[PDB]
């Protein structure tokens, strides 16, 4: 203790525990320190793990300000591939642009993240040229193509997705949830909160009585009552549009044409009966809704307030004020108005 001096500040304390903290955005001043930090830890041993924290907006700002290029993000992942020790990276909050590329370039199985962190990948930003010549635009576009393909190359080895899949989602800025990053291939597991803090906080609200005495029971009842009224509202919206489709199929049954058999000859020959096709077109069957449930009892509501209408029969010749179209429309026996 007497021979070893204490660390003078906070980044020197995290340096002694082999913890690299990327808390600054990707500027050229901070990238020369990270290639000096990772190369110094390789000389102290190629078997010790390296802890890495990621908190930056990448090479650009979140509002759209271009402060650097995307090429400094390429040199950051090159030192991770040149090194030969296991690296455990932890995403801390924000991860935009090249900050999630170095998050995915870690060792598989040790990529960690917070449950409420933010991850996003998008296309790199290009500064304006300033009204230069014509042939420099094609070389500048080739500089975009070499840096976009290099970004898709480093993103494919960290996740495993093909190049054509990753290029289509990168055209728009797609934000990634920590629950969504597991199936995408960004991280490997979710850092859980302290279980000792969870059971002590849950036992404090029961013993002190603050979970029921401060009016929480009357407000949580209104949360279940508003969810019950919202579940009653969309169910009434769904039975009305089902009766509209049932009335649409009943009005379509009074038709005498051969337009349905023309589509059967040009399409496939297997399913001549209504059956499943295992594709996008999942045809629902609405008259096959005979539930017969004796548990959904109707409430204390009487339907005697419904008035009596005219109830015009179906065999009528009365037509509305429309343009004439009865050239081949023969009058049906159930619908003479055609």
């Amino acid at each position: 203790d007497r021979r070893k001096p204490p660390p003078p500040d906070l980044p020197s304390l995290l340096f002694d525990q082999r913890i690299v903290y990327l808390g600054m955005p990707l500027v050229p001043a901070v990238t020369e320190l990270m290639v000096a930090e990772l190369l110094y830890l390789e000389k102290q041993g190629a078997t010790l793990p390296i802890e890495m924290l990621i908190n930056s907006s990448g090479t650009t700002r979140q509002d759209g300000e271009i402060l650097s290029f995307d090429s400094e993000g390429v040199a950051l992942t090159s030192t991770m591939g040149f090194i030969k020790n296991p690296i455990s990276t932890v995403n801390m909050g924000l991860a935009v642009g090249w900050s999630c590329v170095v998050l995915s370039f870690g060792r598989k199985g040790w990529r960690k993240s917070l449950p409420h962190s933010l991850a996003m990948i998008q296309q790199p930003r290009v500064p304006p040229t300033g009204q230069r010549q014509a042939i420099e635009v094609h070389i500048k576009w080739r500089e975009v193509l070499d840096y976009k393909r290099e970004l898709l190359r480093m993103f494919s080895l960290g996740t495993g997705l093909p190049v054509d899949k990753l290029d289509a989602d990168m055209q728009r800025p797609l934000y990634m949830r920590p629950q969504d990053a597991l199936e995408y291939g960004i991280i490997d597991e979710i850092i859980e909160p302290n279980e000792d803090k969870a059971e002590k906080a849950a036992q404090y609200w029961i013993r002190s009585g603050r979970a029921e005495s401060e009016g929480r029971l009357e407000q949580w009842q209104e949360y279940l009552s508003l969810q019950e009224e919202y579940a009653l509202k969309d169910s009434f919206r769904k039975v009305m549009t089902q009766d509209l489709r049932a009335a649409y199929r009943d009005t379509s049954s009074k038709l005498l044409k051969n337009s349905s058999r023309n589509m059967e000859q040009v399409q496939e020959f297997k399913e001549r009966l209504p059956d499943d096709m295992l594709t996008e077109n999942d045809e629902v069957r609405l008259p096959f809704s005979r539930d017969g449930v004796k548990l959904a009892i109707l409430n204390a509501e009487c339907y005697a307030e419904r008035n009596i209408a005219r109830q015009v029969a179906a065999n009528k010749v009365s037509v509305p004020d429309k343009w004439r179209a009865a050239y081949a429309a023969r009058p049906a026996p159930a619908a003479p108005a055609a």
């Binding site: 917070l114 409420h116 906080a201 401060e214």
Partner: protein
């Protein structure tokens, strides 16, 4: 050093920085004691709720301001539709923290998050953001335990 003490006195900033300080305090094995001075903004009240339940102290002159985070930028037509779903998801993400730490319903958090809602020292204890009113004695034990 089984307990940490961080004085919270700030006007707040971005909502992404308030998420990181709340997730870090609920991760360490040591105890986390949070004391606020002045106000607690949207980036500061998450650190107020990030402490353990039982040792959240606020003074008599302390206030608390809860509001939805701002943002937005200029872009194309479909680019605004992507980030507006993100701001609505971040606003639902901070509503999950206020409903878990204060045991409030989810529909009543978004009603108070819709406008700039200010709180006094009395109604902060009644809401659930803090635990009890701070005094001299609750911080006299803090400065004497850190000497050894």
């Amino acid at each position: 050093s089984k307990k940490v003490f961080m004085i919270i006195n700030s006007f707040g900033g971005s909502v992404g920085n308030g998420i990181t300080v709340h997730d870090a305090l609920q991760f360490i094995k040591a105890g986390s004691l949070t004391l606020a001075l002045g106000v607690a903004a949207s980036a500061a009240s998450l650190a107020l709720a990030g402490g353990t339940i039982g040792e959240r102290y606020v003074t008599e002159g302390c206030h608390t301001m809860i509001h939805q985070p701002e943002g937005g930028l200029n872009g194309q037509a479909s680019d605004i539709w992507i980030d507006s779903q993100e701001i609505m998801k971040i606003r639902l993400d901070v509503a999950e923290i206020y409903s878990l730490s204060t045991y409030r319903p989810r529909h009543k958090i978004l009603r108070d998050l819709d406008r700039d809602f200010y709180l006094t020292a009395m109604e902060t204890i009644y809401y659930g953001l803090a635990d009890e009113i701070a005094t001299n004695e609750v911080m006299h034990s803090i400065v004497e335990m850190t000497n050894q």
